[PDB]
Amino acid sequence: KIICRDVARGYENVPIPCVNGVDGEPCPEDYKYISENCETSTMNIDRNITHLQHCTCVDDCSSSNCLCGQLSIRCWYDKDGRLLQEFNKIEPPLIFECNQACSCWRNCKNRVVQSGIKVRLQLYRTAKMGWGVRALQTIPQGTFICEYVGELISDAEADVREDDSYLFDLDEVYCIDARYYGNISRFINHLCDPNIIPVRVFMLHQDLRFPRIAFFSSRDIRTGEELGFDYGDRFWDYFTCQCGSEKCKHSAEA
Ligand SMILES: Nc1ncnc2c1ncn2[C@@H]1O[C@H](CSCC[C@H](N)C(=O)O)[C@@H](O)[C@H]1O
Ligand SMILES: [Zn+2]
Ligand SMILES: [Zn+2]
Ligand SMILES: [Zn+2]
Ligand SMILES: [Zn+2]
């Protein structure tokens, strides 16, 4: 049987199994699973602790006076760590989580992304799109899913790389390249009917060149459902969409 118990090798809060019920391809081995972003050449990230804006809260950061919440416009997390229904899912705001400069505790309410993966996912072989990721549980709208993790590289570097299949733009542009080093998010396919959205988030640094990319569910997700986001019209403008949705706008057909 083609199967891996945990492609993350214990690095995430939960296992991420792999299965293939479709064809003869073994679990992918042509990359290195990493749970946090890496660098090869240095990006010279502004890690200066004194450049962090931070809050003075000594409660759990649930009040509207939390500076970090104000930097985000408001804290968009409800009491359970889910995005509020009012969250702009078309044009998400930048999220500034609490950090090591804040007065609050590490368990405050403004630290969802930095607390890591909580939902049960599976790497699996799709019918027509290669590998994909699907839910092994129901997941309410607004739930943090996973971060787009990979190798941070410059625009000029991305421009000369052989394989652009695993690039996520941090638009002056830097990219996250998950080709050689990446997490579960490298396997998330494009869907014309998407159920997750990427959100830019700041945690341990606030170097605006380098937002981290957090996927949140955009609606309730059912068990077994493939996870997917909108790669965008510019990406689509070699191969055509196989999402198979009645709404597909990028197939060879339509
Ligand atoms: N909607 C879609 N239709 C056809 N291919 C898709 C797709 N979304 C993603 N892909 C494929 O997946 C690549 C992005 S990386 C996503 C994981 C990939 N399916 C894998 O097996 O490793 C794209 O280059 C394309 O090959
Ligand atoms: Zn606060
Ligand atoms: Zn806080
Ligand atoms: Zn704070
Ligand atoms: Zn489609």
Numbering used by the authors: 920 to 1090, 1095 to 1160, 1165 to 1181
Report text from the authors:
SET domain methyltransferases deposit methyl marks on specific histone tail lysine residues and play a major role in epigenetic regulation of gene transcription. HKMTs catalyze the transfer of a methyl group from the co-factor S-adenosyl-L-methionine (SAM) to a substrate lysine and, with the exception of DOT1L, are all organized around a canonical SET domain. Methylation of H3K9 in humans relies mostly on members of the Suv39 family, namely EHMT1/GLP, EHMT2/G9a, SUV39H1, SUV39H2, SETDB1 and SETDB2, as well as then non-Suv39 enzymes PRDM2 and ASH1L. Here we report the high-resolution crystal structures of the methyltransferase domains of GLP, G9a, SUV39H2 and PRDM2, and propose a structural mechanism for substrate recognition.
Mono-, di- or tri- methylation of H3K9 constitute distinct biochemical signals and are established by distinct histone methyltransferases; G9a and GLP are mono- and di-methylases, and SUV39H2 di- and tri-methylates a mono-methylated substrate. GLP residues that contribute to substrate binding are conserved in G9a, and it is reasonable to assume that the peptide binding mode observed in GLP holds for G9a. The Post-SET domains of G9a and GLP present an α-helix that contributes to peptide binding where other HKMTs have a loop. First, a conserved tyrosine residue of the post-SET domain (Y1211 in GLP and Y1154 in G9a) is a major component of the lysine binding channel while its hydroxyl group participates in catalysis. Second, the hydroxyl group of GLP's Y1124 (Y1067 in G9a) hydrogen-bonds to the methyl-accepting nitrogen, thereby inhibiting an orientation of the dimethyl-amine that would favor transfer of a methyl from SAM, as was previously shown for SETD7 (for review). To confirm this model, we showed that, unlike wild-type G9a, the Y1067F mutant is able to tri-methylate H3K9. Similarly, it was shown that the F1152Y G9a mutant can only mono-methylate H3K9. Our structures show that this residue is perfectly superimposed with GLP's F1209 (0.1 Å RMSD), which, if mutated to Tyr, would hydrogen-bond with the ε-amine nitrogen of H3K9 and impair the alignment of the accepting amine's lone pair with the methyl-sulfur bond of SAM. Unlike I-SET, Post-SET is absent from the PRDM2 structure, which lacks co-crystallized SAM or SAH. It is partially folded in the structures of G9a and SUV39H2 in complex with SAH and SAM respectively, and fully ordered in the ternary complexes of GLP with SAH and H3K9 peptide. As previously observed with other HKMTs (for review), the co-factor contributes to the formation of a hydrophobic, mostly aromatic cluster (composed of Post-SET Y1211/Y1154/Y261, F1215/F1158, W1216/W1159/L298, F1223/F1166/T285 and SET H1170/H1113/H220 in GLP/G9a/SUV39H2) necessary for partial folding of the Post-SET domain.
